[model samples]
Target chain A: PEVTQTPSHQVTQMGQEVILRCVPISNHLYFYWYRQILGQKVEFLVSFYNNEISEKSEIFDDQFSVERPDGSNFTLKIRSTKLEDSAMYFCASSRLAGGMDEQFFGPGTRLTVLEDLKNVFPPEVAVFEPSEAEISHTQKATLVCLATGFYPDHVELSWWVNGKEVHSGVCTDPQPLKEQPALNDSRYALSSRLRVSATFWQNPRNHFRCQVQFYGLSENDEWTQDRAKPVTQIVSAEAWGRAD
Target chain B: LNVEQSPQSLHVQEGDSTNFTCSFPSSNFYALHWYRWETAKSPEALFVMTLNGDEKKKGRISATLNTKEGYSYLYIKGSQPEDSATYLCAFKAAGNKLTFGGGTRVLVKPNIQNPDPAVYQLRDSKSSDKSVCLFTDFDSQTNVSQSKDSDVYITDKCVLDMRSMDFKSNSAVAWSNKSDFACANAFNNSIIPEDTFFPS
Candidate 1:
């Protein structure tokens, strides 16, 4: 077995070089270097072994570099740190080069560059607001999804009714981002609004959901708040029955 | 309904070969099935070692079912720490349902290490034989916990403490398919599809 990594956190100044380290338990035939940008996706940078570069992604060639300073330990290096380079870098190893073996992941190293910090933090709040606009004083309503206080501004939104995707009634495009004016705050806000007819809400089985996926934290983390969160809203048809 | 498994609990060293025996009160039954349930994942269908003639072998595991002798046996050779799991033996009764015996819990320890890891205590609120399953951060625990908060819930119906408990036939029987329990209605204990039965 090999020794594990230490000093899981690394802080480097802009234009400064930093090395991220990892040690596998046993001799591994292949090694991989990956980084997950805070509030972004886990990007695979490179794969190497036997003192040879096997494969590398575009992002790796651009600014990243990997090395084996010793027999057991592998490291990733950045020639010069950028504000965008601050992220959690992960190191993994596999006994085989292909799918024939399992790849084991080491605890990651969180890199903080003290610049462009906003992009690394996920949205503070994501809300789904549904309301009625009194279409013929009947059951007509509009559902709005508002995601705010998020940095990097990359997001995905989907509408659902009765557990099924409701794309036909949805307003196709997400509204342009509303930029925050506060100093040092690059967070933005956006919304998705959909229209629903009276019959859509007539059945109690039809509950609406606005699922919003964003980067930062884990990419797949949801704001369901134990399903009690405001990501979901239900409209009652009884209110529309009065209109008839 | 007379299904029995010996050595209800096991502690074996890594790379050691271990054997489990399942027997019924009488030599009367249909085909036999052997399954492996890891701490947190679903019940793996290891082998359906039917009473029909030949023994079944897969990888380092093999199973033999003898209806006339009224027993079945599961053998694991060179078992690793990952092989540590709950082993269950089930038999298809003449009727539609399947009867399962109390599972055998195996803890495969490394050659030399600290004491066995801390076991999370699980209590089934519905039973006197409460601990239906144990966990050391197993996914079955996650699924069971998640199911409690969802529209459906998981219950420990098949227990050594209970008799004539019948389980349905479906992928949901595997702990990995927790959501499939949705087939069992929230309000009613009935399954949506006729074949999926849960013990009363």
Candidate 2:
């Protein structure tokens, strides 16, 4: 499965409460956050999951946390919101082991912390356009899908004639190299691409998507006066390939 | 005094065993840190400076610590055609950043004088996957005469493409034979020195 959709674009007002949930086994993604702190990269930095890699996993924070919402679910909840909390939030995933790269994304689920009861976006689909070209039967074809420009870093993209994730071939992208300083507070300008055999699109209704996953810095930063964040911008991309 | 240990370099001949060592500034040293640096790679610690000394140890390698002058030397007896690496000496302190002396680059050749540089490159990444390589070391800046043949330490700046984001103290980098192989900083008596905070 390539992606999972967000519940809505407007996740209640800031003072009010909201819950961001995710599906697990969910590879190729990381949580980037930013708020009070600036400069530090998004923490919880992701890598090839090696025990002794020189890289330091993002500076971990215990407050304002995440829970394994059951086996396949990941949910993020913020206790209370502030005016400064207003930013574009996204959810992202990654797939490489040893190099410095990032993860893929799902259509973003924007959460805007509002001051008033502004009738924010009515859970809208970010404006995206996907293209498909054909190749010969003997030859291999590939497709790439991309989505960009969002904040708070929580989003995902899936191809949907109506709405569905495009699961096909070799997918890859840039991962949270190092939240220079902390986690979650990273900004986002992400993308997702698919590289499939031209033959795969013979039927035509092949839809692909890009997603962004976002969360907030643990409350410690919230309560603490001075703290800087690492990666404020979270990026995602998805690509499909053929049997070449 | 602090005691740190490290491998000389990479490419220990097949039959030869390698020796990694560490030294410090004081005799009242605590533990020993041992690291290994291969060609075109980062330096990683294989053993931590242990209080209980080690000696005449392994098949090809043995380590000993001297309390008075503050030095722990790792000797590779019966040097085989192999046994090529950069050995390091590390120092430990209560409230100070660990100090590492210039590493001893050893190349067990059939003869001495001119050692093959290719031996520096080896295959050891899969064997271990740690990179702290340790909290990264500052670049080697001091340029001691290569012909001098004494202990050598290299310190240089770790420059990244990103702006304002710089690795101040010691940041490890790939080894280049020709350029700044093992530059050192004369100001600090130690090999790898930085603004390291004393670890409590």
Candidate 3:
């Protein structure tokens, strides 16, 4: 019910100009251009035909131009595509230009400037190790869901005690394991810990679960890949016995 | 800044009723704000109820703030599946910056689909006296090419505006996206890179 883009993927030769296109489902007064290069930031390039062009970033240049080629189409033109210019481009539209109206976004177009062949890999399920908490008659014990060897760190972790979701007594921020340096590999390993009190652990039948969900494109052979899907893991849990 | 939300997630069907409460410490607040983050886009400001006896309502949505009590509430009546999205509550602290509470992700399962509510502009009477600003990763000193960007940042900072504060549906954006206040420090990757710890 909003703006949409066409030719989801565009392959072009370097030095040739290409027009990335979009169409808003309804009429919109303002248009914007943003790009996200793999391993780089999502950048705000420019917004067009404005009373006050919204504030923009510096990635835009005279070489990059935006035009309303016709009544239904709003376009972004790159006079000369460069190897570094290859990225996912997104088009957006706002009912009004640059005041505070929420701009609706269109699914992006992947731009590939012919430079060289490259290899990309999706991260595997994080190694989730839910360690058993030490049982104590009077104190609270900590349970850890230590996950390692994952990448593109947008992951969600959830906990359940005896099959009911436990939100208050849980933490799910994946931290980089110090033993593994960030520079050693782009792949990352992280850990999350949950604390439980004697009130719950004292029950021998009580069970706990820690699960992580990660999204990435599955590799087809070495070059092509499948659509992005979430890979999840339910950390194996062990029964906890009262201290002898 | 520490904040907590009750009923972390709300699941309901069309034509039902739901409400979310945000409790926070750190007082002397300028105003309490609420927003809706629809799927795959930046958040949209829904209501801003200032401290001086103002209560706001838009279609089926209503919001009330109690600064003396250090909390705020967002209520939805006769909900719709189109209402499905993450809702966030935030307030101004330290004069200029905003601190947000962990979002209350609302899920509306389709029952007998309800019509969309009429849209309205969010307003704050006090905004004319002060500016509403959001946090941005764009260093005042650095160029856009040198900016350390991420979906985490763009999704969060899309609403931080310097434009004079007014009730424009699209104007108010956020700077800090992670509702978990404790986890914010780790975003720098330098604050607690290796030995970060969570409290019991």
Candidate 4:
């Protein structure tokens, strides 16, 4: 019931070093760290044991390392944190690494990596406009939720039609919206579609919702206000395929 | 992604009250949760609202779940700049996979340096479908926008040619044929308005 993390919030400069500390459950033998980037999926970073390291994902590459220096303390160190390394780090513990053990998660440590403040363009939500088929008669139509026009270009879209997750009907080809550019410099757009049944759309009581989280970073010459390093960073805008 | 949450983005000042709504499709959702996530950290659980008409609160954060209504609501009272974080409404469903909403990014402005903002993946073989849908390539040289589909297909349609397929702009077009697939394009700024929490 009580796994604790220190420095609930951490602010670090990109390419700098910082260590995230956690006091995992004492009786538990398997410890884990999961990082969820804002607007992204919660992912496994690494797992440790009273066996050193049991597992680590590709994201937990060279720049990051985990330490179990003492008895109760577990630590994650980022030697040269990148701009995209900013993430919420969650620590968890389990009695066993296999199937049935109850895994307890601790309060997370928020790690904010600062690049050039001005160039560090935070993403904005463009619109979650719901568009329906133009029909007059009885219909089995489509509902479209368009997520668009955010900068740095890391955006994730989720659609809810009548309280359920619509999986396939949202024809996501992952093509670039050549025309729908909001900023003209860095913004992008994408859409989600839901194919509804006749009864689903006919009922007036039914409702739909759409959401999008935009996350991306741009090139900035400096980290702070002053001039320092001419920095160029990589950005990813790939179609997030469902994990089935 | 299966969980439905609303108001993907919002802005508020300190002392403002905020509300978020989430709807899960299945009653099989054993438990529902609300989380507070400031950028750069894992979302910390705010409250776990379980059972029909159940509500729970901690500090200024509270949540109510109506399993009967198939929806849950999370409310934040006397909001602070520290309250600025992405609030995620998530649920644990039938299998090992926990689901999440797209998240509501709450930004409370009007001056503050630091504030306290608090806040799973299920990998299971619950569903029988082994179909793999790979539409984009991570190492493609050309931009995904210009390239052809990655040649992945539904298991049943494995014999079909994926590269021959094209995309549709409007999903409504060719509704009966089911031959064409489409996506929506939203560019007009007029339709998308900002929500400001100015306690008036």
Best by lDDT: 4
When summed lDDT is taken over every stretch of 10 residues in candidate 1 chain A, the lowest stretch is A232-241
**Ten-residue region with minimum lDDT total, candidate 4 chain A:** A235-244
Query: Residues B1-200, candidate 3, lDDT per residue (tens digit)?
Result: 66667787887766889998987663666666676766544456686656545577878888887777788788989987457777867665433223456678887654312211111111111222211111112211211121142322211111111112211111111122234422223234222113322222
Superposition error at A55 for model 4 (Å) = 11
Over the stretch A62-164, how does candidate 3's per-residue lDDT look in tens digits? 7787777666888888998898888878787767532234456676677766542222122332212211222321143344443444644444556676777
**CA shift of B151, model 2, Å:** 58
Question: For candidate 2 chain B, which ten residues in a row score worst on lDDT?
Answer: B115-124
Q: Is candidate 1 or candidate 2 better by lDDT?
A: 1
lDDT tens readout by residue for model 4, B5-102? 78888877557898878888755756776778664344565766556777788899888878766788788898874587888776655433345677
Worst 10 residues of 2 chain A by lDDT: A118-127
* Clashing residue pairs in candidate 4 (N, C-alpha, C atoms within 3 angstroms): A87-B40, A87-B41, A88-B40, A88-B41, A88-B42, B36-B119, B44-B119, B45-B119, B97-B122
Sliding window of 10 residues with minimal summed lDDT for model 3 chain A: A125-134
lDDT of 2 by residue, B12-126 (tens): 4334555555656654455555544433222334454445445435455667756566667676766753244555444544421234465677754332221111101111112
RMSD (CA, Å), candidate 4 to true, equals: 21.3
Q: What is the lDDT of residue B63 in candidate 4?
A: 85
- The Cα error of candidate 4 at residue A5, in Å, is 5.8
Please, what are the lDDT tens digits per residue for candidate 1 over residues A102-140? Answer: 344565666767443324334433222222223333234
Off by over 4 Å in 4: A1-21, A25-31, A44-71, A75-88, A93-244, B25-28, B38-44, B68-70, B94-98, B109-200
Chain B alone: TM-score in each candidate? 0.54, 0.40, 0.53, 0.53
- List runs of model 1 lying over 4 Å from the truth: A1-3, A116-244, B1-200
Q: Which scores better on TM-score, 2 or 4? A: 4
lDDT string for model 2 (A55-119, tens) is 22232222244544343455555667656444433333334321222232334344656454321
